[PDB]
Amino acid sequence: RRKPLFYTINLIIPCVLITSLAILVFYLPSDCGEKMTLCISVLLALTVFLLLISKIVPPTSLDVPLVGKYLMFTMVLVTFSIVTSVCVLNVHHRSPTTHTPRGGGGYVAMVIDRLFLWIFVFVCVFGTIGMFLQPLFQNY
């Protein structure tokens, strides 16, 4: 009943957990040099995630094509999340276009960004449950 499904997800918990904290500075208000450093610092966890998940030391490394093929998709989710910053920065203090009211920081952009962010978050779980569904075929 155990199955590797628990092991594969065991690495997803700490992998996505980083986003929860990143949002505290990204989504929530926190205008400061740390706010940005936090977004870029994430890129470090991505590259490390490869050696970290691979350091698990599998029995027969049967999860080679599973993870290796994921790096291609996960790479698009990490890059898409970074580029999104342009939306907040566009109103924050980098080429102001003026679309929504209020100001002061880059929280105003969150209004319009919420549209894209909606699908973004879906991508995180999409690939999370997608791989978890593989081993959860049925068995009965």
| Number of other CB atoms surrounding residue 93 within 10 Å | 10
Question: What is the token pair recorded at 128?
Answer: 């999370």
**Considering the domain boundaries, does residue 55 fall inside one?**
yes
Query: Whole-angstrom Cα distance, residue 108 to residue 91?
Result: 7
Residue 43 sits at the vertex; the CA angle it makes with 39 and 48, to the nearest 5 degrees, is 140
Residue 82: which domain range?
5-133
Query: Whole-angstrom Cα distance, residue 9 to residue 67?
Result: 12
Residue 134's identity, in one-letter code, is Q
Residue 98's identity, in one-letter code, is T
Considering all CA atoms of the chain, what is the largest pairwise distance in Å, rounded to the nearest integer? Answer: 59
**DSSP secondary structure letter of residue 131:** H
Residue 115 maps to which CATH number?
1.20.58.390
Please, are residues 22 and 38 in contact by the beta-carbon 8 Å criterion? yes
**Considering the domain boundaries, does residue 139 fall inside one?**
no
Question: What is the token pair recorded at 8?
Answer: 């594969």
Number of domains in the chain: 1
What does the chain come to in residues?
A: 140
Query: Whole-angstrom Cα distance, residue 26 to residue 39?
Result: 7
Nearest to 112 by CA among 86, 76, 82: 86
Residue 69 sits at the vertex; the CA angle it makes with 81 and 67, to the nearest 5 degrees, is 90
Give phi and psi for 100, each to the nearest 5.
Answer: -115, 160
Alpha helices, DSSP H, located in 55-84 = 64-83
